Design a protein around this nucleic acid. Structure first.
Lengths: 117, 122, 138, 205, 59
RNA sequence: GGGGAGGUUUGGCACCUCGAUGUCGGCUCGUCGCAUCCUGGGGCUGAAGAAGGUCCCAAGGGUUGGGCUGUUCGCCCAUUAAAGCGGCACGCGAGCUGGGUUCAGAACGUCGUGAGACAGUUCGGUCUCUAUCCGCCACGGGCGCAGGAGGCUUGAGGGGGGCUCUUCCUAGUACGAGAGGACCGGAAGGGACGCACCUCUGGUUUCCCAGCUGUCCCUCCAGGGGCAUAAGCUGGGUAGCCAUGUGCGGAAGGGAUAACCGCUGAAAGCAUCUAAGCGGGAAGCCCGCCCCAAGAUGAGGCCUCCCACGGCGUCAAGCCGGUAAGGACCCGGGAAGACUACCCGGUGGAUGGGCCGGGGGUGUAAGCGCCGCGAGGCGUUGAGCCGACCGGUCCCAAUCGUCCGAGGUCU
RNA sequence: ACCGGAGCGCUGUCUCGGCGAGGGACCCGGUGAAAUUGAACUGGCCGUGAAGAUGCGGCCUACCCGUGGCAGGACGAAAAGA
RNA sequence: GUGCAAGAGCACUCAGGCGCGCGGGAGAACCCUCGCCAAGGAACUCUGCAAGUUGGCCCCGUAACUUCGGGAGAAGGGGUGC
RNA sequence: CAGUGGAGGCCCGAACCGGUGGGGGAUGCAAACCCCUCGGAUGAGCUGGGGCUAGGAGUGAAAAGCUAACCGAGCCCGGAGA
RNA sequence: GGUGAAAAGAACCCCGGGAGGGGAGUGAAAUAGAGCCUGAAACCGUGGGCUUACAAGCAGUCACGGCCCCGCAAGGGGUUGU
């Protein structure tokens, strides 16, 4: 009984990881972001987790954040603007919602990350 | 799991020190023996001054195996090998010098002699 | 009736709340048994252990101990047949739990790779006649 | 040939007696009896059996709040014990006593379209020597020209999962009224927290 | 061009039927509140919108 | 010395096939046959018992694993209640193998003046991804069942399942000089096999945690990242997936029977187990058992639930537009699944995720003081992290709402 | 890097297979061939028949069409048989 | 460029170039190619075909035989990091 | 004997020739190719350039192999509508 | 190979990125609209008449029934339940 658990795929485990992380970077830079639905899902989960970590403020955590990510100014704006606002928020700081048309060329269900505040 | 084409070293005086697994006395489809079992045996490695030379074909009863078997109360037990005891065509431990811990499972089967001289039964 | 775990935890009239705390370091003394056509015995078993696998109900422990022949491996179901079972000197500072590398080289390297934490024995020293101080304070 | 409805939970090994016992528990609980059946207007002898209460608006309409006694509907609705006439009230769990053997019915979980090895069971073969092209494959099916037909029911590559089975001869060692549970020699089919009917065993009568 | 090769032509009607269970398929639309057009269900319309309707910058 | 049957062998024939019908054994997958090898029963015996022999009935289930040879056949091996024979293109190459075979090389023994050739041998040597119809196994869409919806059923027919060993007890009594050694019933374990299940056992986890290499970069230090697989390497590993693991299935019993053993009883005063009647009697037959299954065109049954004239058919069955039980579209999903379908929840809601707790995995981290010049290490510490998991929690995603839906044939 | 025989260690060759992998296979959209092809409306048994049939007799199972899958048969495709 | 006995080798990477002219979801059978495997250890097979164990550098050690060159990396074993 | 020196159709192995055991590919990336493993490896070596030898003729460390992807006699074209 | 007698070979508005079309307009004719005279079949479309979801086939023949369209009658063509 395969799949009988969860977790979406289609990449190298590494390629997966790097994709999630990147999407998080490009995200946190902006806030409202266009992607494909499955991506969008596992995305919103992952990033949400990271943001709840940001809700704290320990250096352990901080590096762990940028251990999964890259830019330092990004951790600045993370723990200086982003993390402060979503203080009271104990959940999904991201909201992803579907778009019409579908991804032209091969028809794919689209969706949009949101800042949610 | 002891099956044929397996090397088993004995745990007594004997006149042998290594015996290979031939067949099982069990039902003609039970290619599997373990604790307190009856295994026919070829002799592959023995020690000169002795009784059962190299090439002899006698019988045997396992005392010790690398695959622990669950005792009826859910608590198993393993001896790091594939050790047996030599027996004849009359169910008799040929030697007299049993070596190391046996399994009391043998005690229930009909090898009461071993159980006795067995130092640390488990 | 939802939480199946709730139910299984209500099956917990079956629990051992009186057993020596140990890590997969060492353990040692005694166990339980049967032995003979009426039962009647508790065959003592020491041991240097190997695995603690946690199941709540029956978090079982596999134990290594090398006797008069060679190495022997006995696993116990943490909760009934074993009466007191109680060990000798627990030991620890083990990095993993699964001591499988000991079925490779069981020798002086065994001794050369295990130190009990003194702090444990210091706790034992305190709790020794603090237990009489326990039989003294309210 | 009595019975009870039940949901699955647990599997352990309760070191009862002296040895050990793989113990699967089930919650029979307040499982209703909401309509008997009689020969002329039926043809058998039976009773419908409900289960777990949480049903509000999503159910409605016929209910059998009609029937003759309401009692609302569970939410896991109801099935049928054959050859069984009860005492009336919503039966519970203590229908059986610790010391009996029984039969137990339930769906087998879904392993879906599977390979003939993991199905009826075949063999396939040659990991190396032969080839690589027929590892997990059936090889043969039928004769040359006569038949020239492929045997009906020739154990073939297909589905193996979301089915159903009734097990015979188990041994319910425990039963707790206080929380409505029934503990047997662990053998239960189907996943945990699912559908399963208990009925008495068969042996010599 | 290997082992399996159609042995005798396939009749027109057969082609038809293979494509009988084929054929195109309808769409399905939903009314947009706080707006006046059609959208896919639970989606957002760049002409209508969701709650608040984010974007809606059509020229 | 006669008479047959069988169609496997070995031959005679040359009718389908020379615009091809790919020949051996083995793998895989079988199924049938009975002239039964094993297991029941029974007959007779130059049958005390034991075991044996032989003959009739009986295919339900079973027919093991290694050595040599390409080899089937055979012998051997250790065994088993048993190691049966045969058919199906001597089953099966659009299913595998290609070791054997009758391609081109070469040699070998060999015949030939010779090129070459020899039921004489030896070494090597390319089985062609895409299934159109049938057939088989799983799955749906349409229509069906002469009101419309849910829910619970009934069993037409069919499929599966049928094994089998040792041991203790009766009693070492019967028989037998003894050696041996029993029927009848009971009791306990075994093996192979089908079934289902993660509790225990153990493999499993593609990023759950740890140790680590050279490296390149953030940021010089610690620290942290990717590469090295499509996890760099190793040590461990929850859930779910599993077998060696684990609970179970073969029963009991009923009914008709074979071969055969019997009762009352004639023709033919006596006899008979039969030509009337009746009883015992098998792993065999029917059932009980498990599973499918009303497309059981004959659409069954039960329990409820909803109900006309609204516009053309006046009388005749329709036709057309929304409604009432209802059901669906889309979504959030699912120990469900190729798609579909089957199952669940959709704000009145815990369905995914996020959150917090529980378990469980890993094993004292990032950093802080502290000892050695130093690698490091004492302590802060069973900490930190945390994949599926038992659940709590509307923080966010299941918004809005759309469309199909009886107007109830007759005799 | 030529053909046997042996032995040790070693190992999924086997007992006997179980999970896992990504990539193809399967569903969404864009493009989209081939050999073969008398016409088809193509179940089975049992006989027949120029001797091996869905098409013939007798006599057969099963609503209509499809998706994934296997490969016994259509004396299967490619070779006017070496 | 750095590291390993060294190097036009290998692992990462300078600089330069590139992501290979369809993809998107699922997360079946099965297949390509790849990891782990219990306990038993060629029982598989025409055959250890294949896969795996061995693995580099300093030390130790080496048969019968021989055309004295060899066979020799014989085999068997010890270390290696900071 | 030591040191010296650096000889080899020497030794292990890149680039470089090959094509051995296997898997894959089979209307293929491909009218011979990919992956694993293999053998030459200072020599009978390998490689860029210009020149030569031919159809019963050459070229051959020798298969009747090569002479333009099919060689027991290349291709063409003519007797030839043999 | 071929517009047409002659280029008179399509200004203008319309939708559309164009592409191409809808009138206008050209001529006897644009069903002569630009490799366009005349447009067989295979060939794939579209509307309507008949028939088809218990059904065994070299597919039609023959008769009986019914449905639609013809015909003044009687007759007919088309269709297919059997």
């Amino acid at each position: 009984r395969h799949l009988k658990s969860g977790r979406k795929l289609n990449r190298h485990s590494s390629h997966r990881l790097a994709l999630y992380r990147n999407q998080a970077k490009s995200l946190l830079t902006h806030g409202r972001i266009t992607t494909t639905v499955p991506k969008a899902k596992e995305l919103r989960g992952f990033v949400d987790h990271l943001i709840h970590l940001a809700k704290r403020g320990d250096l352990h955590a901080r590096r762990l954040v940028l251990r999964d990510l890259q830019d330092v100014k990004l951790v600045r704006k993370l723990f200086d603007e982003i993390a402060p606002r979503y203080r009271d928020r104990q959940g999904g700081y991201t909201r992803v919602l579907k778009l019409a048309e579908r991804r032209r060329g091969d028809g794919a269900p689209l969706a949009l990350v949101e800042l949610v505040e | 799991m002891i099956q044929p084409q397996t090397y088993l070293e004995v745990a007594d005086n004997t006149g042998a020190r290594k015996i290979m697994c031939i067949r099982v006395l069990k039902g003609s489809n039970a290619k599997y023996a373990t604790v307190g079992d009856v295994i026919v045996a070829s002799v592959k490695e023995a020690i000169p001054r002795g009784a059962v030379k190299e090439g002899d074909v006698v019988k045997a009863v396992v005392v010790r195996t690398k695959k622990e078997i669950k005792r009826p109360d859910g608590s198993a037990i393993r001896f790091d090998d594939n050790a047996a005891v030599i027996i004849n065509n009359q169910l008799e431990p040929r030697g007299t010098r049993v070596f190391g811990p046996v399994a009391r499972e043998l005690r229930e089967k009909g090898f009461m002699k071993i159980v006795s001289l067995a130092p640390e039964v488990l | 009736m939802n939480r199946g775990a709730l139910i299984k935890l209500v099956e917990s009239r079956y629990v051992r709340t009186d057993l020596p705390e140990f890590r997969p370091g060492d353990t040692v003394r005694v166990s339980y048994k049967v032995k003979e056509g009426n039962r009647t015995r508790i065959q003592d078993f020491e041991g240097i252990v190997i695995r603690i696998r946690r199941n709540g109900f029956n978090t079982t422990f596999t134990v290594r101990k090398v006797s008069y022949g060679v190495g022997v491996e006995r696993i116990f179901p943490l909760h009934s047949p074993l009466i007191q079972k109680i060990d000798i000197v627990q030991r620890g500072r083990a990095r993993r739990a699964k001591l499988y590398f000991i079925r490779n080289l069981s020798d002086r390297e065994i001794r050369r790779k295990l130190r009990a934490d003194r702090k444990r024995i210091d706790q034992d020293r305190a709790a020794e006649r603090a237990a009489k101080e326990e039989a003294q304070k309210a | 040939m009595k019975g009870i409805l039940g949901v699955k939970v647990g599997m352990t090994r309760i070191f009862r007696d002296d040895r050990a016992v793989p113990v699967t528990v089930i919650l029979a609980g307040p499982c209703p009896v909401v309509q008997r059946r009689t020969p002329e207007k039926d043809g058998y002898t039976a009773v419908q059996l409900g289960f777990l209460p949480q049903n509000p608006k999503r159910v409605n309409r016929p209910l059998k709040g009609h029937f003759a006694k309401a009692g609302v509907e569970p939410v896991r609705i109801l099935r049928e014990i054959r050859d069984f006439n009860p005492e009336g009230d919503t039966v519970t769990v203590e229908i059986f006593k610790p010391g009996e053997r029984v039969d137990v019915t339930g769906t087998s979980k879904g392993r879906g379209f599977a390979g003939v090895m993991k199905r009826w069971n075949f063999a396939g073969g040659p990991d190396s020597h032969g080839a690589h092209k027929i590892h997990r494959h059936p090889g043969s099916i039928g004769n040359r020209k006569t038949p020239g037909r492929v045997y009906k029911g020739k154990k073939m590559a297909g589905h193996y999962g979301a089915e159903r089975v009734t097990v015979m001869n188990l041994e319910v060692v425990d039963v707790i009224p206080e929380e409505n549970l029934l503990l047997v020699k662990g053998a239960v089919p189907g996943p945990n927290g699912g559908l399963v009917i208990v009925r008495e065993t068969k042996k010599a009568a | 061009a290997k082992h399996p090769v159609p042995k005798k032509k396939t009749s027109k009607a057969r082609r038809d039927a293979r494509r009988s269970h084929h054929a195109l398929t309808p769409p399905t639309l939903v009314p947009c509140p706080e707006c006046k057009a059609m959208k896919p269900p639970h989606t957002v319309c760049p002409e209508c919108g969701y709650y608040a309707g984010r974007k809606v910058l059509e020229v």
